[PDB]
Write a protein that binds this ligand. Structure first.
Ligand SMILES: [Cl-]
Ligand SMILES: [Mg+2]
Ligand SMILES: [Mg+2]
Length: 263
């Protein structure tokens, strides 16, 4: 039909809670696409970072991983509509633990090309967000990659692919952004830095999200929001929370990802 209009019209849902969790579509709707994350930015190692797709045609998306500590959190994002877009196929990939200088690479299934997506690089431990980064996948390619940055130890990505001739695909563009990041600042009441994910000129938002990553994800559940359709940008401030022990500062990173379409 028309991919930008269809994706814009579909309903976005962004859910935070203990993992695995689930996010539900509004009554009468089913998943078109989405992802579920397990994240923990305090515990050591990288096993607590995971992304999976939300399979289409289900009334909800179930998450992944376990609630082993209070710092384990789920973040689930879905786009819901009356029915699936069968031409869409989702792909996730992740690196092994201790990924080193390894670039993560995932390809679309045969005869499909990227609609959009993003990749994240992370490191565990209470200071691991110092190594956080996000990159977008690029519409019209057959591949998406994520390279390590600033001492990261794991890469993961999620993307959506579609049959290469699908109407309107050309009108789409992906933007990911890392906003303010570093030590959290409890002195900044709901103003602890920001992320501002901007559409390129003459485009407006189809869908997307903004999130605050935080050493204690369980204290920033409200800082995970869908991005407003047809706006020129998507903005979020940091909560300003810091539960670091004694002199330690919790870390945070404000980030997001959008797809925009031509107006
Ligand atoms: Cl510190
Ligand atoms: Mg693009
Ligand atoms: Mg930037």
């Amino acid at each position: 039909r028309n991919l930008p209009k269809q994706l814009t019209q579909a309903t976005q849902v962004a859910w935070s809670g203990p993992p695995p969790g689930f996010a539900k579509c509004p009554g009468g709707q089913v998943v078109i696409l989405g992802f579920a994350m397990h994240l923990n930015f305090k515990e050591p190692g990288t096993d607590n970072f995971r992304i999976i797709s939300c399979p289409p045609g289900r009334e909800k998306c179930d998450g992944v991983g376990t609630a082993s500590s209070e710092t384990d959190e789920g973040r689930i994002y879905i786009l819901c509509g009356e029915e699936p877009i069968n031409e869409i196929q989702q792909v996730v990939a992740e690196s092994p633990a201790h990924a080193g200088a390894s670039v993560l690479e995932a390809s679309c299934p045969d005869e499909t090309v990227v609609v959009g997506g993003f990749g994240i690089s992370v490191r565990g431990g209470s200071d691991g967000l110092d190594s956080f980064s996000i990159e977008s996948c690029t519409t019209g390619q057959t591949i998406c990659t994520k390279a390590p940055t600033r001492g990261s130890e794991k890469n993961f990505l999620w993307m959506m692919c579609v049959d290469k001739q699908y109407p309107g695909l050309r009108e789409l563009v992906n933007v990911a952004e890392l906003g303010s990041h570093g030590n959290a600042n409890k002195r900044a009441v709901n103003s602890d830095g920001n992320v501002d994910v901007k559409c390129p000129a003459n485009s407006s938002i189809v869908l997307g999200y903004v999130m605050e990553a935080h050493t204690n994800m369980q204290f920033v559940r409200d800082k995970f929001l869908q991005c407003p359709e047809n706006a020129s940008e998507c903005k979020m401030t940091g909560k300003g929370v810091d539960h670091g022990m004694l002199w330690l500062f919790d870390r945070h990173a404000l980030f997001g990802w959008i797809i925009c379409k031509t107006v």
